[PDB]
């Protein structure tokens, strides 16, 4: 019913598809970053997963933060010593936008082990706001997932959580995931989750909605399927640990399929 | 953000919000009359306020002739200046001073139709307003009315998640919020607009409660106490109590006596208990009530 805004969901889907291209980071920014690497970014994101967990933040908040970070690093060159400061301010801004009860600034200062000062975090908050020009209402993977979820027949929580999980794993690895739009990673995530749990495939009804097919999703899906298979071996483990929790139905303990057969 | 404060001349104070004051100002180069909202950040020890972050981020992408236009944002180290399109008055002040023997039916119809256009645009762009009330509806000399004050607004996902409770000024607050419901949606904006419709006709608030429970009771006594038939789920709601008095629904023609059949029809659909059955802004635009509106559509702003 109204919680799924029947009268507006298509308008909204269309709008998000337009806004996801505008809020997209530059696919090749890390090569132009003299002092930071994909691996450092990965450590940062992993830590922001932990921060989200420590403060029981929404997953939406985590996704916004990563978006803010990647857009910022697209135009601003950053020394390794200051990457965490960008991340911290991004998490604060994302919290203030998405959270009912955002953690206070002091708690953000706290989790950085007093590497930075209250004033440093605050000054960085303004810089991100200026760089992004307050374009904070970005489409995320999750915004798309939750609408795709409405096409399950019937709803299945393992499917939902597993898709959430796979989408989260994608935030960690700028290569290759920077090359895909939220709507596509979400598509791939939903289809992989669906297949793993139920053996079913990306629904026709979502081909109607999205215009995407297994064909158009195929590249992304192959990457996500690798990321899933290797997930126990990745240097970064905070998402796996998080998705062991029963809140997410222990989905990180499911077995990835050895093949997609398509 | 090409603006500079050097280019504005302040003209007079016009109002005061939470983090500051609003001046009518004049662009010294273009001639444009704007409203400047100041938001001091030096005072703020928690950095840029979340209200302001939501207002700016959300108003950026809401370009619509019935939504007040954010023209620019100036960001000093100690101050933040939102530059808005200037509208001379709000609906509350218009009802108090000039609408003494009432608003003409033509003008009420026009205002309602424009408010629905504005609100439909918000929902189409995944924004709940969450504070629709006459104070927050600005009117110009040309006959336009526009949604304003997006300090309480929020970007929603589909389906919606749990957001902040007890939102919306009490008199305009929907039953589902009053009953502590886990989830609320676009239907809370419609309820407000419905209260506003009634208010434009009578020039008094429809449900002037002095507490959460008093607000409910007033609503119940006007539309009847809802049960499982009119509203499936109601009795399972977190702050629903079996002890609630059971008032009979009085005939809707008694709620707003001067109102015609078309008017009553549309009002009832805006004030439907079940958020799922309540009319959407998009559907309400096609209601017969509006058949004879001809006021030319307001023009977008740059
Ligand atoms: N946009 C405006 O003209 C305006 C905004 C807020 C107030 I309080 C008064 C006027
Ligand atoms: N909050 C109150 O004061 C109140 C709550 C429930 C009833 I039944 C009456 C009053």
Q: What is the CATH number of the domain that holds B150?
A: 1.10.510.10
Q: Which of B15, B58, B7, B9 is nearest to B37 (CA)?
A: B15
Domain of B44, CATH number, reads 3.30.200.20
In DSSP terms, which residues pair with B27 in a beta bridge?
B8
In degrees, to the nearest 5, what angle opens at C-alpha A65 toward C-alphas A59 and A71?
Answer: 140
Q: Quick check: A194 and A148 in contact, CB under 8 A?
A: no
Cα(B103)–Cα(A220) distance, integer angstroms: 59
Task: Give chain B positions within 8 Å (CB) of A67.
Answer: none
A127 interface with B at CB cutoff 8 Å: no
The dihedral of CA A6, A7, A12, A17: what is its sign? positive
Say which DSSP state B71 is in. E
Nearest-CA residue for ligand 1 atom 7 is: B15
Asked if residue B288 and residue B208 are part of one domain, the reply reads yes
Please, what's the largest Cα pairwise distance for chain A? 54
How much helix, strand and coil, in percent to the nearest 5, is found in chain A? 70, 0, 30
- Please provide residue A86's backbone torsions phi and psi, each rounded to the nearest 5 degrees: -65, -50
Q: Measuring from each residue's beta carbon to the nearest atom of ligand 1, which residues come in under 6 Å? A: B 14-15, 22, 35, 68, 84-87, 138, 148
Q: What is the DSSP letter of A234?
A: S
B42, B72, B131, B227: the active-site residue: B131
Q: Which of A192, A180, A178 minimizes the C-alpha distance to A148?
A: A192
Q: How far apart are CA A115 and CA A128, in angstroms?
A: 19
How far apart are the C-alpha atoms of A176 and A170, rounded to whole Å?
9
**B49: Cα separation from own chain's centroid:** 21
Helices A80-98 and A59-75: crossing angle in degrees, nearest 10, is 130
Residue A122 belongs to what H/E stretch? helix A118-132
Nearest alpha-carbon partner for B94 in B141, B151, B129: B141
Question: Is any atom of ligand 2 closer than 6 Å to the C-beta of B283?
Answer: no
* Domains parsed from chain A with CATH numbers: 11-24+138-262 (1.10.472.10), 25-137 (1.10.472.10)
Task: Return the number of other C-beta atoms located less than 10 Å from residue B226's C-beta.
Answer: 25
C-alpha to C-alpha distance for B198 and B28, rounded to whole angstroms:
42
Residue with tokens 């450590």: A43
Whether cis (ω within 30° of 0) applies to the bond prior to B271 is no
Longest dimension (CA), chain B: 65
Residue A40 C-beta-side C-alpha neighbours within 13 Å: 19
In the numeric block, which tokens belong to residue A190?
Answer: 């939903």
Tell me the two tokens of residue A96: 């203030």
Neighbours of A252 (CB within 10 A): 21
**Tokens describing residue A193:** 């989750």
Per the CB < 8 A criterion, the answer to whether B192 and B172 are in contact is yes
| Distance from C-alpha of B90 to C-alpha of B133, rounded to nearest angstrom | 10
Residues B282 and B136 in one domain: yes
CB A251 within 8 A of CB A162: yes
User: Which residue spans within chain B are E strands per DSSP?
Assistant: 8-16, 21-27, 33-40, 70-75, 79-85, 89-90, 127-128, 137-139, 145-147, 154-155
- B88, B104, B129: which is the final residue of a domain? B88
* Bridging pattern class, strands B70-75 and B8-16: unpaired
Reading the block at residue B72, the tokens are 């620019």
Instruction: Flag if A126 and B75 touch (Cβ within 8 Å).
Output: yes
Do B120 and B76 share a domain, yes or no? no
C-alpha of A181 from chain center: 11
Rounded distance, CA A157 to CA A159, Å? 5
Residue at token pair 């209601």: B287
Inter-CA distances, B137 with A256, B65, B114, B129, B235, Å: 54, 13, 11, 12, 34
Contact A98/A139 with Cβ under 8 angstroms? no
Burial B177-213 (b: 16+ CB within 10 A, else e): bbbebeebbbbbbbbbbbbbbbbbbbbebbbebeebe
Q: Are B218 and B159 in contact (CB under 8 A)?
A: no
- Residue B134 shares a structural domain with residue B264: yes
Q: With the CA atoms of A182, A184, A187 and A191 taken in that order, what torsion angle do they form, in degrees rounded to the nearest 10?
A: -130
Q: Judging by DSSP bridges, how do beta strands B79-85 and B33-40 pair with one another?
A: antiparallel
Q: Resolution, rounded to a tenth of an Å?
A: 2.4
- Structurally, chain B folds into a number of domains equal to 2
My answer on whether B206 and B101 are in the same domain is yes
In order of A93, B61, B63, B141, the CA distances from A75 in angstroms are 18, 22, 27, 44
Gap between the Cα atoms of B186 and B126, Å rounded: 9
B293 and B220, same structural domain? yes
B81 and B98 together in one domain: no
A92's CB contacts (< 8 A; 6+ apart) are A102, A105, A108, A121, A125, B47
Characterize A47-77 residue by residue with b for buried, 16 or more Cβ atoms within 10 angstroms of its Cβ, and e for exposed.
Answer: bbbebbeebebbbbbbbbbbbbbbbbbbeee
Residue B91 tokens read as 């609906």
Tokens of A147: 């609408």
Q: What angle do CA B32, B133, B56 make, to 5 degrees?
A: 50
Q: Among B62, B88, B114, give the residue marking a domain's end.
A: B88
Last residue of a domain, one of B88, B121, B138: B88
| Residue A173 in tokens | 């690895």
Query: What CA–CA distance (Å, rounded) separates A155 from A152?
Result: 5
Residues A110, A113, A117: CA angle, nearest 5 degrees:
65
The beta-carbon neighbor of A125 closest among B48, B61, B126 is B48
Q: Between A and B, how many CB-CB pairs are < 8 A?
A: 107
Q: Is B42 a catalytic residue?
A: no
Instruction: Provide residues of B within 8 Å CB-CB of chain A.
Output: 1, 41, 45-50, 53-54, 56-58, 60-61, 73, 75, 77, 123-126, 155-164, 183, 185-187, 275-276, 278, 280, 282-283
For residues B198 and B134, the answer to whether their CB atoms sit within 8 Å is no
Residue B28 is labelled as binding a ligand = no
A window 195-234, beta carbon within 8 A of B? none
Three-state DSSP class for residue A210? helix
H runs (alpha helix) in chain B: 50-60, 91-97, 105-124, 175-178, 187-202, 212-223, 261-270, 281-284
Per-residue DSSP letter, A232: G
- The reply to whether B54 and B181 lie within a common domain is no
Same domain, B28 and B44: yes
The three-class DSSP label of residue B159 is coil
Rounded distance, CA A212 to CA A190, Å?
A: 12
The whole-angstrom separation of Cα B48 and Cα B57 is 13
Query: What is the experimental method?
Result: X-ray
| Burial class of residue B294, CB neighbours in 10 A (0-12, 13-18, 19+) | exposed
| SS3 assignment, position B72 | strand
Please state the φ and ψ torsions of residue A31, each to the nearest 5 degrees. Answer: -65, -30
Claim to verify: residue B136 and residue B20 sit in the same structural domain = no
Asked if the Cβ–Cβ distance from A2 to B187 is below 8 Å, we say yes
Nearest to B231 by CA among A7, A1, A176, A40: A1
Q: Which range marks the domain in which residue B79 is found?
A: 5-88
């Amino acid at each position: 019913g109204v919680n799924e805004v029947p009268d507006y969901h298509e308008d909204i889907h269309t709008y998000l598809r337009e806004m996801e291209v505008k809020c997209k980071p530059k696919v090749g920014y890390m090569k132009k970053q003299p002092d930071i690497t994909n691996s450092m970014r990965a450590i940062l994101v992993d830590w922001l997963v932990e921060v989200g967990e420590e403060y029981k933040l929404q997953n939406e908040t985590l996704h916004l933060a990563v978006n803010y970070i990647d857009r910022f690093l697209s135009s601003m060159s950053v020394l390794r010593g200051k990457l965490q400061l960008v991340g911290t301010a991004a998490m604060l801004l994302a919290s203030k936008f998405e959270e009912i009860y955002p953690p206070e600034v002091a708690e953000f200062v706290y989790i950085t082990d007093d590497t930075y000062t209250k004033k440093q975090v605050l000054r960085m908050e303004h810089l991100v706001l200026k760089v992004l020009a307050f374009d904070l209402a970005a489409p995320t993977i999750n915004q798309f997932l939750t609408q795709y979820f409405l096409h399950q027949q019937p709803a299945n929580c393992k499917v939902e959580s597993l898709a959430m999980f796979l989408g989260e794993l994608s935030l960690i690895d700028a290569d290759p995931y920077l090359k895909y739009l939220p709507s596509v990673i979400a598509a791939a995530a939903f289809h992989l989750a669906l297949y793993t749990v139920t053996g079913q495939s990306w629904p026709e009804s979502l081909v109607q909605k999205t215009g995407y097919t297994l064909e158009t999703l195929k590249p992304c899906l192959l990457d996500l399927h690798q990321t899933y298979l290797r997930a126990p071996q990745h240097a970064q483990q905070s998402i796996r640990e998080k998705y062991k929790n029963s809140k997410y139905h222990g989905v990180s303990l499911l077995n990835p399929p050895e093949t997609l057969n398509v | 953000g090409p603006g500079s404060m050097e280019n504005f001349q302040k003209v007079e104070k016009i109002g005061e919000g939470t983090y500051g004051v609003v001046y009518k100002a004049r662009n010294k180069l273009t001639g444009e009359v704007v409203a400047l909202k100041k938001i001091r950040l030096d005072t703020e020890t928690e950095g840029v306020p979340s209200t302001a972050i939501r207002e700016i981020s959300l108003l950026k992408e809401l370009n619509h002739p019935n939504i007040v236009k954010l023209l620019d944002v100036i960001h000093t180290e100690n101050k933040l200046y939102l530059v808005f399109e200037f509208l001379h008055q709000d609906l509350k002040k218009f009802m108090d001073a000039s609408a003494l023997t009432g608003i003409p039916l033509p003008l009420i119809k026009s205002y309602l139709f424009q408010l629905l256009q504005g609100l439909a645009f918000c929902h189409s762009h995944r924004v709940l307003h969450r504070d629709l009330k006459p104070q927050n509806l600005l009117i110009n000399t040309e006959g336009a009315i526009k949604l304003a004050d997006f300090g309480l607004a929020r970007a929603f996902g589909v389906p919606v998640r749990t957001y902040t409770h007890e939102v919306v000024t009490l008199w305009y607050r929907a039953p589902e919020i009053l009953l502590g419901c886990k989830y609320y949606s676009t239907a809370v904006d419609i309820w407000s607009l419905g209260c506003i419709f009634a208010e434009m006709v009578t020039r008094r608030a429809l449900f002037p409660g002095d507490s959460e429970i008093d607000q409910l009771f007033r609503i119940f006594r006007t539309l009847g106490t809802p049960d499982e038939v009119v509203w499936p789920g109601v009795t399972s709601m977190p702050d629903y109590k079996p002890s609630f008095p059971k008032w009979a629904r009085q005939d809707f023609s008694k709620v707003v006596p001067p109102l015609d059949e078309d008017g009553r029809s549309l009002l009832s659909q805006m004030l439907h208990y079940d958020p799922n059955k309540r009319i959407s802004a998009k559907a309400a635009l096609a209601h017969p009530f509006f058949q004879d509106v001809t006021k030319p559509v307001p023009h977008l702003r740059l």
